[PDB]
Amino acid sequence: PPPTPR
Amino acid sequence: GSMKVSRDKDGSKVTTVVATPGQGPDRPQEVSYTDTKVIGNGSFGVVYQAKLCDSGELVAIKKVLQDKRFKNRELQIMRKLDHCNIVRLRYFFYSSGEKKDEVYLNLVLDYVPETVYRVARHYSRAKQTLPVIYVKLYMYQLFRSLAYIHSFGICHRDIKPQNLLLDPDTAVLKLCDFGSAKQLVRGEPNVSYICSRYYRAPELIFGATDYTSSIDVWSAGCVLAELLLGQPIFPGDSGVDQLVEIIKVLGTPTREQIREMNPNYTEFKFPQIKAHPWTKVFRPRTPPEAIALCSRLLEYTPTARLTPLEACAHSFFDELRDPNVKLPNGRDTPALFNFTTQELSSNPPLATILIPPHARH
Amino acid sequence: VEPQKFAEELIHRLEAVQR
Ligand SMILES: Nc1ncnc2c1ncn2[C@@H]1O[C@H](COP(=O)(O)OP(=O)(O)O)[C@@H](O)[C@H]1O
Ligand SMILES: [Cl-]
Ligand SMILES: [Mg+2]
Ligand SMILES: [Mg+2]
């Protein structure tokens, strides 16, 4: 799972 | 980025780059390495092993693509870290790669040959259980690294066996992979879909955005349970699958516990499933104090979970504080009591327990 | 992810495993 989007 | 590629003294390909050291002010220096080979690969990028030409020491080079879509704090987080149970960032530099006219970030780290996952997998396919002494050693060092990063307000957000590097000879554990890590600030929301499957805290599965560093403690509890059990304790493809496994062990959370995790779920009528006793969860030969510790980590209410520093002081690790303990290979245990003021900042009086009298001399 | 839809699935699953 990826971190928060920009 | 400029990268001089040449050969030297044996036809061995030598790569020269100008790399910035991990610590201190930015003072980049020429770094030469050889014997480059891929030891890891994925959608994140590539991981190479290489040998520094000067010292001859082995290093890992994590080469990740500068993705403008998401936020990556991996570099900025690793640069401020310096602890014996966290993998060291020696240098970093920028270069090109597969994508045309694109820029990649290269992280030069200490090379550590094994992981907790690979070691655990050996015992699983051999139908053996990891000796309790190693469970103590690995878990203790994990909690120290957590106590360290939490003191800066940094949450790893991806604690799992694959991210725990091991040097089996010295039994030293090093936490790695800070691509999901973040400095948590109260009042500022965080992404909920974080942490790897099997190790995701219940509040994360419930979709909380106001979670704290205690999610790392839950994940650590999952690692502990896994080492004792020989397999993941809460497997499942989806969040619901994993939550069912958790409920089958802990029992249905109370309304108050649900509120502590995510208030938006307090008014639903979940069926009441009885808890399965921890002594029945693990094998009958499992040490009572390991069961006790695990039940204090795997708690629904995040504030009820032990802090990493408190976990180190738990009775399960009492053996490690014995003067006459040695590794099964014959060597002494790694450094375990060299706590700094920063590590103890969360709870200074714990030093009485954490530092045994035979360690103060 | 609606809390309603999520709880609905969870309740369904828990009823299946409930003694
Ligand atoms: N410093 C290292 N030395 C040796 N192996 C490493 C090192 N760092 C990472 N690895 C190995 O490469 C794998 C990927 O590293 P990691 O940082 O976790 O990448 P990712 O962010 O994609 O998960 C790890 O599972 C680990 O086994
Ligand atoms: Cl039940
Ligand atoms: Mg990883
Ligand atoms: Mg990562």
Numbering used by the authors:
A (entry chain C): 1569 to 1574
B (entry chain A): 24 to 384
C (entry chain B): 383 to 401
Paper text:
Glycogen synthase kinase-3 (GSK-3) is a highly conserved kinase that in higher animals functions in insulin signaling, microtubule regulation, inflammatory pathways, and developmental programs including Hedgehog, Notch and Wnt signaling. GSK-3 differs from most kinases in that it is constitutively active and controlled by inhibition, rather than by specific activation conferred by phosphorylation of the activation loop. GSK-3 prefers pre-phosphorylated substrates, termed ‘primed’ substrates, with a phosphorylated serine or threonine residue at the position 4 residues C-terminal (P+4) to the serine or threonine to be phosphorylated (P+0). Here we show that the auto-inhibitory pS9 peptide sequence and the inhibitory LRP6 c- and e-motifs all bind to GSK-3 as pseudo-substrates.
We determined crystal structures of GSK-3β residues 1-383 phosphorylated at the inhibitory pS9 residue by AKT at 2.1 Å resolution, as well as GSK-3β bound to phosphorylated LRP6 c- and e-motif inhibitory peptides at 2.3 Å resolution. The LRP6 complexes were produced by replacing the first 12 residues of GSK-3β with the 8-residue c- or e-motif from LRP6. The LRP6 peptides in these chimeric proteins were phosphorylated by the chimeric GSK-3 and by CK1 added to the purified protein. In the LRP6 inhibitory peptide complexes, residues 1569PPPpTPR of the c-motif or 1604PPPpSPC of the e-motif are visible; the second phosphorylation site in these peptides is disordered and we were not able to ascertain whether it is phosphorylated in the crystallized protein. Residues in the P+1, P+2, and P+3 positions (Arg-Thr-Thr in the pS9 peptide, or Pro-Pro-Pro in the LRP6 c- and e-motif peptides) form an arch over the conserved Ile217, and the P+1 residue packs against Tyr216 (discussed in more detail below). In addition to these interactions, the LRP6 peptide complexes also reveal a water-mediated connection between the backbone carbonyl oxygens of the P+2 proline and Tyr216. Phe67 packs against the threonine at the P+2 residue of the pS9 peptide, and although Ser66 and Phe67 are poorly ordered in the LRP6 c- and e-motif complexes, modeling them in the same position as that observed in the pS9 complex shows that Phe67 can pack against the P+2 proline of the LRP6 peptides. The P+5 position has 63% hydrophobic and 81% uncharged residues, with a strong preference for proline, which makes extensive interactions with Phe93 in the LRP6 peptide complexes. Although the second phosphorylation site in the LRP6 motif, which is three residues C-terminal to the phosphorylated Ser or Thr in the P+4 site, has been shown to be biologically important for LRP6 function, we do not observe it in either the c-motif or e-motif complex structures. The kinetic and structural data presented here demonstrate that the phosphorylated LRP6 repeat motifs act as direct inhibitors of GSK-3 catalytic activity.
